[PDB]
Amino acid sequence: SHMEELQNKLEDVVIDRNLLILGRILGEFGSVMEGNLKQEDGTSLKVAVKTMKQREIEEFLSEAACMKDFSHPNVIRLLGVCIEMSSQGIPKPMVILPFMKYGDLHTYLLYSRLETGPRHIPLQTLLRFMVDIALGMEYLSNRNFLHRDLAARNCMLRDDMTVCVADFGLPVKWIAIESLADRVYTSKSDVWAFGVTMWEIATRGMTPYPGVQNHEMYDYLLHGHRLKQPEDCLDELYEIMYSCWRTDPLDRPTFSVLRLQLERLLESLP
Numbered sequence: 322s323h324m325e326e327l328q329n330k331l332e333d334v335v336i337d338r339n340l341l342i343l344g345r346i347l348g349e350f351g352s353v354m355e356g357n358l359k360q361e362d363g364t365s366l367k368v369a370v371k372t373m374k375q376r377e378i379e380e381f382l383s384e385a386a387c388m389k390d391f392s393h394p395n396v397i398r399l400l401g402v403c404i405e406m407s408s409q410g411i412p413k414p415m416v417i418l419p420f421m422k423y424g425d426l427h428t429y430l431l432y433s434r435l436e437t438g439p440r441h442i443p444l445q446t447l448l449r450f451m452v453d454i455a456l457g458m459e460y461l462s463n464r465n466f467l468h469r470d471l472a473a474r475n476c477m478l479r480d481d482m483t484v485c486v487a488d489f490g491l492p493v494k495w496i497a498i499e500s501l502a503d504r505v506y507t508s509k510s511d512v513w514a515f516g517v518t519m520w521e522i523a524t525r526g527m528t529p530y531p532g533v534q535n536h537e538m539y540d541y542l543l544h545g546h547r548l549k550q551p552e553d554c555l556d557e558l559y560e561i562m563y564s565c566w567r568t569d570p571l572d573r574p575t576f577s578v579l580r581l582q583l584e585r586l587l588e589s590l591p
């Protein structure tokens with residue numbers, strides 16, 4: 322039953338604080354730390370730990386339990402959560418994820434445009450990044466999960482270069498036209514944000530809409546303007562991402578449709 326499934330998820334989301342040791346800051350709303358997690362088989366695992374600052378706390382726990390129960394290779398796996406208490410009596414919620422040494426997709430795309438950073442990223446890999454993200458989002462949306470902050474900064478690179486969808490939980494230019502006004506939000510709003518994320522990846526990390534300030538943003542879209550085609554972006558890839566920003570959400574493709582369009586384009590590549 323609905324209460325049964327929720328209580329089951331709740332049961333195995335919590336990690337004993339003594340199985341975890343925190344390490345150095347990776348980033349600093351909250352902070353992200355490197356850490357170690359003792360697994361049940363006796364060995365420890367490198368993890369990332371995210372820390373923040375009672376009705377909100379059950380909300381954090383139940384939403385963490387829901388994400389951990391999700392399982393798909395292009396959705397970040399949430400290993401568990403841990404609730405500390407601060408001296409001043411403020412709870413300190415912590416989220417445990419696998420440590421991914423390649424970091425987030427956005428910083429990686431930027432790094433790749435520096436000699437010392439990752440090598441230049443071929444088109445084939447850039448489109449394989451989009452396929453991966455579309456796969457995680459297909460799985461999520463088939464569950465009526467709404468992401469609401471999709472962007473390359475929130476996609477993570479795994480050791481085998483698989484991309485998985487995440488949310489640091491810590492952006493006008495990613496928000497669908499209808500959500501800018503009515504604040505209505507559907508998976509078709511997520512589809513809009515995916516289109517922009519595809520554009521981030523194709524530009525190797527440009528901020529969307531150069532020359533357009535955030536306050537000008539809804540007016541800019543109101544008159545039918547969209548993100549421009551990056552150079553050396555295939556026209557077929559640009560039409561796919563343009564389809565994500567159709568004015569009428571109902572006309573935008575689903576993630577399942579997008580994913581197959583993108584897998585089709587990828588195999589056509591010599």
Ligand SMILES: Nc1nccc(Oc2ccc(NC(=O)c3c[nH]cc(-c4ccc(F)cc4)c3=O)cc2F)c1Cl
Nearest residue numbers: 353369370371388416418419420421424486487488489
């Ligand atoms: N190097 C390195 N390696 C690993 C992680 C890392 O940082 C982090 C990267 C991601 C996260 N995510 C979360 O806390 C999180 C919490 N609730 C829900 C989601 C979620 C939301 C939507 C969705 F579709 C999928 C998941 C989360 O993602 C935390 C980090 F600390 C770093 Cl920096």
Ligand SMILES: [Cl-]
Nearest residue numbers: 363364365366
């Ligand atoms: Cl060990």
Ligand SMILES: [Cl-]
Nearest residue numbers: 420421479480
């Ligand atoms: Cl990994």
Ligand SMILES: [Cl-]
Nearest residue numbers: 530531548549
């Ligand atoms: Cl643009």
Ligand SMILES: [Cl-]
Nearest residue numbers: 546547548549
């Ligand atoms: Cl345009």
